[PDB]
Write an enzyme that holds these catalytic residues in place. Structure first.
Site, PDB file in Angstrom:
ATOM      1  N   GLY H  56      51.439  28.537  33.422  1.00 57.68           N
ATOM      2  CA  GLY H  56      50.264  27.764  33.053  1.00 57.68           C
ATOM      3  C   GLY H  56      49.804  26.804  34.138  1.00 57.68           C
ATOM      4  CB  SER H  85      52.906  31.776  36.941  1.00 56.04           C
ATOM      5  OG  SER H  85      52.506  33.120  36.893  1.00 56.04           O
ATOM      6  CG  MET H  86      53.739  25.627  37.275  1.00 53.07           C
ATOM      7  SD  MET H  86      53.716  25.324  39.080  1.00 53.07           S
ATOM      8  CE  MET H  86      52.734  26.646  39.602  1.00 53.07           C
ATOM      9  CG  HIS H 110      51.267  35.174  40.152  1.00 55.67           C
ATOM     10  ND1 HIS H 110      50.653  35.766  39.055  1.00 55.67           N
ATOM     11  CD2 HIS H 110      51.286  33.844  39.903  1.00 55.67           C
ATOM     12  CE1 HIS H 110      50.277  34.819  38.203  1.00 55.67           C
ATOM     13  NE2 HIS H 110      50.630  33.647  38.701  1.00 55.67           N
ATOM     14  CG  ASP H 159      50.932  39.540  38.885  1.00 56.31           C
ATOM     15  OD1 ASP H 159      50.564  38.469  39.384  1.00 56.31           O
ATOM     16  OD2 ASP H 159      50.519  39.946  37.779  1.00 56.31           O
TER      17      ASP H 159
END
Lengths: 179, 6, 179, 178, 179, 180, 178, 179, 181, 179, 179, 178, 6, 6, 6, 6, 6, 6, 6, 6, 6, 6, 6, 6
Positions: H56, H85-86, H110, H159
């Protein structure tokens, strides 16, 4: 689409009528007018009703049916692709000996479909109308196919798909148009 | 569709 | 919303059950549970069912009705505001001599509402079910009000609104509750 | 919102808040509060504070009939607004004990409804709604002292009164002054 | 609504479980949990399952059914208002001799409902699955009612509404609970 | 869009029918009419059916199929762009020796797609129908390509993308039409 | 619904309910219940009751890895349905202690997903889902005793099993009889 | 959902924080608060951050990140399910030697994602900012994993899904927690 | 979510107020109320306003602002994650010497945003209102940062993103809170 | 719009075809038809395909591509405004020495876009297919430009915008059309 | 609308109407109209009447490059509004032959667009739109005589000009006064 | 189809009422009737009717035009004549009103709606009961049934076969196929 | 965040 | 998750 | 509201 | 579900 | 509602 | 519902 | 618009 | 676009 | 497409 | 529809 | 807000 | 509508 007159209008001059869609009031009106037109041009030559239709409104379909039976010309019926529901009824409505299906065409018969909403009394009236409607259809289909009303009532209870050959055995058509 | 219709 | 135990729970300690909405499955199961609960605490003392309802599900209403009739205690019914459709049927279902309405309360009787979509055969089944429902209701209403089944049938053909004084005259309640 | 919750504290002083549109939930709650207060003390006054645009007529009659049925006097005080069935309940309070604050607004008018379907169905709904209007007008007449003729004229369209005008009309007895 | 112990939790203390809604996965998990809790409290005293439900998910219904058959205590079933579809299947699953309905309760039986979308092979698979599901339901209904499989098949082809008295003759319940 | 007659009507004058869309009832009725019109005009001269289509209704496609087989003229099929599902079935239906694809054209074969919702019995009916429909399509394809039925069955189980040259090898077409 | 709520009451007897679609919230809750129970008592069996149509693969694997990591044996009991990830979890319970009720449904199939964008993106998504499936199929092979090649074949499309068939397959050890 | 304290509050007593959803500002304010609360109770004992998250908001993640680095206690990170991600950035942010994943946990890295609409000048600002954000994410990741900035840039271009073992190999975590 | 008292209530006992969302009237009524309550418990001890906010309503921001400056206690401001727009305005508003940001925190400044619809005269009234609001904001930011009103004006013309270190150079904060070890 | 013969029909008389929109199946059917018509009218004179297109369907584009290579006349290509994606592919497909762009025209090359959902096997089929499609595009672009396939692969990895002069240097066109 | 066709009648007089938003359709038509007029007569002036809020940049450049390519002088006349790419095209008229009616509005500003996705995609989009702005400013400079720096600053925000201001800027050569 | 087909039947004095009756339909049918009178005021007109009904006022537009013009207007029901449709079938020159054997005729009371103040609902109810009264009066005269019988027979949807519509007096002949 | 806030 | 976290 | 209600 | 789970 | 219910 | 359930 | 355009 | 196309 | 179709 | 209409 | 409110 | 309009 194409210009050959449009293509359908060109076929109309050879006394071919296309019933190539759902049967509603607009379509019935067009087909009916086409039948009347062709009769007035020539009350002796055959008319050819080409049928690829999933069916539709019963009363629209009866407008077409009664007009077929009223006119002097024999109306030949040819199933291409599909004749379902009121479309199969119309296929069977053609002049005996002149009802055809192409070999991979599908014919389907079933009971009428409807709706009703409101008071118990309104629902009763709706139920009674649709059952009367079904008796009317079945009686006419019997006479046309040579099948009894009892057998037609059984065979239309659920959706019943026939091959061209099976439709000929049933009496909905006279001949599989072979290549 | 002839012969026979038309 | 407001507390004192919230207000309904406090009235439930006085054997008062409030039926103040449309009758659906949720409302019925709550009413039924309240009735059962009260009978288990004391099977002699009266229960008071207060009614302000536009009606709703017939089968939910019958869950209530059959529960009222099954338990030992007398169930008084008081109409405040309105008792329409299954709400009026429940009002009429209170113990004889103990069915009341406030002076300005509306009572409305009519025939059951419903709906059906599909095949002729499915419409028929639905129509037959709702007509049997109507006879079941009417038969019970006749017995409760002292009216004939024929009078009830005619009087519930369309929405028929009654004053508290008319419902008393009709047999739906025993007394108008004066200030 | 704030804190028992403010409204529950006021109910202990025998104040009932009618501060929303009138539907069946609201009526059921107000009727229950009236019954509870009478069961606690059948002789002390109850206070009905009204800020409502009105709503359901039958819901409003559930409250009206309850007020008249119980022994305690029910005082009515209008704060802000009493419209439609709201203003009918304001007039419903015990004689001598209906008030409005000075800048409060009272609005009277005819019932609102609808009908759809067969001619005969529309006729029934029309017979019904006219009868509902006659009943409200007859009750309002008795409460206000006004003639039925004059209530029929004055509720034909939306009719906004100041508190002082509502007093003159007889919907309340006094304008509550600081 | 009322308190209180909400009224349902109070009834649960008397070993009464309410199935008063549509049967989905949450309702089943809850009814299952209630059954297991009651058996753990006492593995000999009867449980009472009250049914007012239009039915719902078959696998959810089977979570309940299998839990009923697994536990030692007899589970009485009582239909109030309505038991339809998986609701009537669970009504019939109660301990033999302790299946009841109130006089005005409706019981409805019918075949399972579903869907399937995609490639011919996928539809085939979905078709075979719901057909095998129907055969499982029917075989268990047969054993519970004393009716043949063939009879269950034919009587569930379409929505079939029974009165309390008809349900009893059918073998879905043992007794009509008279007031 | 452009006038010359509109362009499609002008090609129809040279016995070319253009199938450049999804196959539905309206497209099939038009193509059927065009085929009947061309046979009336001249029962012996070749018709050229250009196919760029993702497919569509099976019944609509069989209206076209059966018209092709009934009439006397040979119908040449030429794939440009894509011929998928019913579109590839029609490509395969052109007169033998006269089915073509351009070099970068794609052909895709797969099983029929459909849907049913309702009672178990109604689902059964829908299923039997779509299975029979499949069988009919595979049998015809077997006869048009020379592949066994069992092989068609396996190879249509999932989306199967062919190059023009693969479709020739498969027997769906007769030649890849090469540039001068 | 009924009241300690009934699921909290079962959790005290070391019973966890997996009674819904498996998403991250559900998995977070089951993982936590697992860790909690192990800390309450690191030796006593835990019981996972499964009635689920499956759901997220990574959510399910959070559950699966927690099961394998903790000391207590996790019995699994299929009631109603165990499909997709739900059947993979059923199969993951401690050996000799994986059960279904007699009318319970078990379904196995391949993972499902989606991908949109550039060719390179579609390829990445495709490689990832293919690796996910090989991972799932290998674990099911080890848990059932079936070859990979058979699992691959048997999960190619939706494959429904009776409880008795799941037993024969090796997804459970026993059908729980009445 | 279940009570033991809700289950999460109970685990917070053992210094476990659950980052089990998308990272937005509410989730960050909560995680930050839990971290500060744990440190104030005991500034020496380890905290445990359990991560199952698709990621997010980067700024929200950075509120978490900076709080982890500011407080004295070691924050262990444990990936269960997914860290993307985060989510994977925070996984890598745990104390050196105390970053874990379960065997079948999925880790994805990513580049950051965003949008900009309006004037060329506005777009330029939006682009510069997101390019700076990425450079800041990449620099910290290099330092935490020991990979060069150039390799992080390339491996995060699209990704990139890693097994837990591959994450370990990459230096995003220190150990796979084998059972 | 968690109970430790919920976690925020727990931190409030330590005089920590969390502004962790968009600034609207509800958020302002809440923070204002917290600030007044804390000053009432003790008019001497510092309060700590933790800020992670993308901004919001200027008037709601000014309820918080004036309240901060009204009360006796020093309000420290700590930026974690992000302080944008009115968020950064509130960050700069902390007691001088006690305004912080964490190292990877972002700060953003820009002009106010609004809208106007209707008659030309209506549009004019709204344009004049928003430009006066922007002068009022900028004049206060000037005084707090030490930058000129001319420079604040230019630097807020478009969205202007600052690192923590740049926010300190700018005067929006006093110190970058760096991690001990 | 204007008459103007509508303007485009008038230009078609001069052997100008206008590809001035998104490439879909309808557009491809028109362009193909125009090309075939023109070749039938005169198999030796040049055709002029003017291109202002953001691209669209690859298979549609290939219907146009293959028609261009198939027919006898040279097809000149003229980029006005923009040729992106399949648009630039077709610009590059014009007869050698006769591919032009106006000085401020924009050329954009990039890899194909698509989608896939469903089972793992289905995604894999869709992945394989789009990768083959890309290799086919890249190989053709290599042959048409003179660039290696590896260079095409790299320069189409993301959206790559070229000026007319750059498109010429790259080999996508032969000449910038100067005023 | 009226007969007266009025626009086709005006095209007989070599007047082209640009009376709408500029998109690919409008461009294809204007470009065609220009080429057509040149084919009829490569020496008689053409008159481009502009009432347009602008629109697509690439579309606008198709018109621009066609104006510069053809031999005829293209006169421009701003009636009502020439904004954004509308004003660009106003300025592209043959020098000495750009006009506006006295109450016409000219507006100039920077290009608008949008970008979504990865940091790298946003960069590419940002670079592309900044390049497009530079190209626009460079050409506008040369047409107006204003510097690139001035054009840059003047277009930073929406900049509205009276006809007389457009003349002083060098966007037009004369305000067309009435007789 | 050409192919114009309806325009060719109009040369033969054939008018198609083959849709829902709205104001556009009415306008068109009226113009056609008037036009046909203008061409020849002695020769018969044929109005073919496949229609579910529609607006009552639009239907009366057509009714009054039929009755006013000099030529007899024959009516032929094909498929369906319902509601205002059936009315118009019944409005054809006496002795020249037909239905095809499987055509459907339906008669019922008019439908409508009203919302707002009790007074507005009264007005809509009065207007619709007057419209029904007018329609029943005309149908009495056209069919030879009493008004009381038409009221009863139209209280709900009432579906008639061609043969029943003859007996009822709505048509004169069922057009049988020679 | 102590030291120093608080 | 102990040993070792916690 | 006292005096007088209550 | 006991015996045996639990 | 007493007297009489209750 | 007793007697008999319960 | 003449004189002068055209 | 002539010369040269056409 | 000639030669050969047509 | 003749005979007789028309 | 004291002094003076409260 | 004649006689009389027209």
């Amino acid at each position: 689409i194409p210009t050959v007159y449009d293509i359908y209008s060109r076929l109309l001059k050879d006394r071919i009528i296309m019933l190539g869609s759902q049967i509603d009031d607009n379509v019935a009106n067009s087909i009916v007018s086409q039948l009347l037109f062709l009769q007035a041009q020539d009350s002796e030559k055959d008319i050819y009703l080409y049928i690829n239709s999933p069916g539709g409104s019963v009363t629209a379909g009866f407008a077409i049916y009664d007009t077929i039976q009223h006119i002097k010309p024999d109306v030949q019926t040819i199933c291409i692709g599909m004749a379902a529901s009121m479309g199969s009824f119309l296929l069977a409505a053609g002049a005996k000996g002149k009802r055809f299906a192409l070999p991979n065409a599908e014919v389907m018969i079933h009971q009428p479909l409807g709706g009703a909403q409101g008071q118990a009394t309104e629902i009763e009236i709706a139920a009674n109308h649709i059952l009367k409607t079904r008796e009317k259809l079945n009686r006419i289909l019997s006479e046309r196919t040579g099948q009894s009303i009892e057998k037609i009532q059984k065979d239309t209870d659920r959706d019943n798909f026939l091959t061209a050959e099976e439709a000929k055995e049933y009496g909905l058509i006279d001949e599989v148009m072979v290549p | 569709f002839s012969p026979x219709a038309p």
